[PDB]
Amino acid sequence: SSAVAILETFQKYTIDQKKDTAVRGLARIVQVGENKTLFDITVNGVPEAGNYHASIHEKGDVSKGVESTGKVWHKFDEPIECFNESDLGKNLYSGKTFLSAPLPTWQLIGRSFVISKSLNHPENEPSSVKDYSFLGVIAR
Numbered sequence: 001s002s003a004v005a006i007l008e009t010f011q012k013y014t015i016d017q018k019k020d021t022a023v024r025g026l027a028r029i030v031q032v033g034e035n036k037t038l039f040d041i042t043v044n045g046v047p048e049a050g051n052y053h054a055s056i057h058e059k060g061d062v063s064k065g066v067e068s069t070g071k072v073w074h075k076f077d078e079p080i081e082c083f084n085e086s087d088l089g090k091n092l093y094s095g096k097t098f099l100s101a102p103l104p105t106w107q108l109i110g111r112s113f114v115i116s117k118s119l120n121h122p123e124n125e126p127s128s129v130k131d132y133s134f135l136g137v138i139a140r
């Protein structure tokens with residue numbers, strides 16, 4: 001059993017001026033046990049280097065980005081380190097990791113996969129937006 005989440009920004013951020021696509025990462029999801037899923041995560045094109053954090057939120061509603069997705073339903077403890085500079089002109093970064101969760105794929109479908117990091121300079125994209133986030137509905 002497999003699934004995928006295409007991760008896009010929904011918010012507009014001053015620091016993110018890459019306009020050919022809003023896609024900033026991919027989660028490829030494969031069940032690897034009766035009740036265990038593997039998450040193959042890659043990130044690309046994010047403006048700030050740092051440790052990013054993944055969660056799965058309760059709702060598949062991304063109309064308002066993270067703010068419409070409800071609460072955190074599953075949290076991953078392991079960070080995603082994004083320190084590889086992949087765009088020199090724009091100074092954008094990439095990263096990758098494998099994560100796992102003790103959940104079958106069927107319980108994941110239709111929820112939102114979210115990766116986020118606190119903004120280095122929130123005063124310049126204020127004031128209710130604290131985090132840079134990119135997210136996508138999980139689909140079979």
Ligand SMILES: [Ca+2]
Binds near residue numbers: 048
């Ligand atoms: Ca940058």
